[PDB]
Amino acid sequence: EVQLQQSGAELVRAGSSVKMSCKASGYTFTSYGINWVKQRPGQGLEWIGYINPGNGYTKYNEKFKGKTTLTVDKSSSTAYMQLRSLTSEDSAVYFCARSVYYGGSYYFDYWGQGTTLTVSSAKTTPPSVYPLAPGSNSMVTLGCLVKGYFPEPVTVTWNSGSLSSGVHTFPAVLQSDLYTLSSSVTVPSSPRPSETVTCNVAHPASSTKVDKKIVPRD
Amino acid sequence: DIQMTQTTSSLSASLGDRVTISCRASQDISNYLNWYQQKPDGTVSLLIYYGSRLHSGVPSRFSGSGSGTDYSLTISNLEQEDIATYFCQQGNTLPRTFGGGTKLEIKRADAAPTVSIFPPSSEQLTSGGASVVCFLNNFYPKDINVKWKIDGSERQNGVLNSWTDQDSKDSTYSMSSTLTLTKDEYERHNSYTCEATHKTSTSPIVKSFNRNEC
Amino acid sequence: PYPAWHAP
Predict the structure, then answer these.
(1) Are the beta carbons of B92 and C4 separated by less than 8 Å?
(2) Which of A57, B32, B41, B57 has the most CB atoms less than 10 A away?
(3) According to CATH, where is 2.60.40.10 located in chain B?
């Protein structure tokens, strides 16, 4: 098959730059073009520019020009995209794709998994796990606020797994340059505070495995 | 240049139906249109190319058409596997442009959200911060407006929301909303409210607590 | 006015 393995996630400080890879396999690297598409998780896809491996030619999207640079190396079938003077606006996942000719034009027939680029000054920091107990009825919801960590991901489970049904762990959101997420579990009134309910949040990046117990009150 | 408007952001349907996703160019593209299907997992793959007719080794039940500015991907005999986001792309002029994309979801019967509000934790307050959290769980349709009130009036700074994708067992959505304040601002007020407007009732679903009754 | 590869 045709394959495109892109680089690993990237973490960088605004003002700085980065260089991602796109290694091609299973086809003649120089017989096809590589395009770059950005997907900020806002609203769609943007065409950055592109390049002809054999040709060395490059064509940019006016917007991404000036801060973007596409290159290639052919003694190892790899293409590179370099972003400069990064900003919050450059946080997105970037894809590379192959271009095939047909009719009088192109289209992308194969893509890479994509490369996540988070522009930030944070450093690995463990989250604070706050227990969410109700406030002063046959089913009761309890929460757990995982606040102030970096970088993703975070693993949350309740009672180490034994509490599986009725659990909603939400996508993390960036606030303060740090991620924050929440999780909720719904157990009958007979289990809590009668028994113990604990959220277990793991954060591989900082080698942290926190177990927070949800106790009555505040 | 030519920009594509996929004019429906989220499209709703049942397994088995005939789904039609549209896309309009702000100018004639002489049939230089392509369709991609991105999955929740993040990966993108091609479907149909050129004028919308041409196949790239895929299920026959994927078909394309259109002719000037108006095109469409039609998934007859829809399937689970097919639940994903579809983007159209024009290859007539530079720069290349895609549409906003259209995301399919499974059709389910309406369900009001269950709502829960939670005061700041002791643990957190001792750190000088204060976050009030509100979950709105297992609701459908997925459109919803959460509104916070402090001491009776709206508040909008600090509010950060998160939404889960449609669930796999049931086809409901869940949402979390969090109001973050400093410890002092929080202790300067009494009542906190989480109001959920959803077209399940014309009346909001209200949850709140007072720091005094705490 | 300037080069491309399917268009302007």
Answers:
(1) no
(2) B32
(3) 1-107, 108-211
